[PDB]
Amino acid sequence: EIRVAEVADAGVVAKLLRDFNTEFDTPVPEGLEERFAQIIAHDDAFVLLAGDIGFAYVTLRPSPYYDGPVAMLDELYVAPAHRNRGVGTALLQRVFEEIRKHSAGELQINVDEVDTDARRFYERHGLTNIEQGSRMLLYIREL
Amino acid sequence: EIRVAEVADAGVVAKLLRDFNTEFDTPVPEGLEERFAQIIAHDDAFVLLAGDIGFAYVTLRPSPYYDGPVAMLDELYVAPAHRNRGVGTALLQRVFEEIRKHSAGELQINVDEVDTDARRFYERHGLTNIEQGSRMLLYIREL
């Protein structure tokens, strides 16, 4: 079942993030558990856990467009063996429920263009890459 | 010169965001000044002002990958008469300087695909849309 992670869940959340990066051949940094523990306790953010087979990491940040925050689904992951079983749907449905408690004006997610499975999942559940008749692109600089 | 906005600057910031949305036929919510006043008062966001003809709005949110926050350039705007004069470059350089004071691990910007001029501006100043050989997309749902 889906539940809101507590500080003591930081080890499981960090373990899942490590599998996410390992699956996609991405090096992971040290101290994931200690940082998740501090984030879950203090920051304007939360983690949802689907047992220990999936998680969603959501951050909340201010916007002049709404009284509430803008939510960002920074990480959404379901373990490969438990995919295509409604877990991702349940996690995302709970994300919308939780951010609605904060009166979040909008949910945002960054997605790779080549991840067609994830894009179709998000489009099937009400998210769009289109604003004002244009695709939206994410630009970054790692520092 | 370019300065960090204070709460007393919320009026000029809200006026510039209004002009930004007005120029691009984007709806403007009520209460921009009062929301900017509250947002500027707090520590997870800031506004850089280039006199009264340009601004940058940056939010900071936690990440498990860095001790510092992930920075997001949510708005970057220069008044039409003052464009192409290096004001945007100076604002973006100040953005990098300010977020470095927060030990920000990454800067993120959402850019419309059609805005080829802004895309070239960001690309000339160290921002990339490519990750592991794939373009990066933003998906949203307004709520």
TrEMBL record, chains A, B:
<keyword id="KW-0012">Acyltransferase</keyword>
<dbReference type="InterPro" id="IPR016181">
    <property type="entry name" value="Acyl_CoA_acyltransferase"/>
</dbReference>
<dbReference type="InterPro" id="IPR050832">
    <property type="entry name" value="Bact_Acetyltransf"/>
</dbReference>
<dbReference type="InterPro" id="IPR000182">
    <property type="entry name" value="GNAT_dom"/>
</dbReference>
<feature type="domain" description="N-acetyltransferase">
    <location>
        <begin position="1"/>
        <end position="143"/>
    </location>
</feature>
<dbReference type="GO" id="GO:0016747">
    <property type="term" value="F:acyltransferase activity, transferring groups other than amino-acyl groups"/>
</dbReference>
<dbReference type="Pfam" id="PF00583">
    <property type="entry name" value="Acetyltransf_1"/>
</dbReference>
<protein>
    <submittedName>
        <fullName>Aminoglycoside N-acetyltransferase AAC(3)-XI</fullName>
    </submittedName>
</protein>
<keyword id="KW-0808">Transferase</keyword>
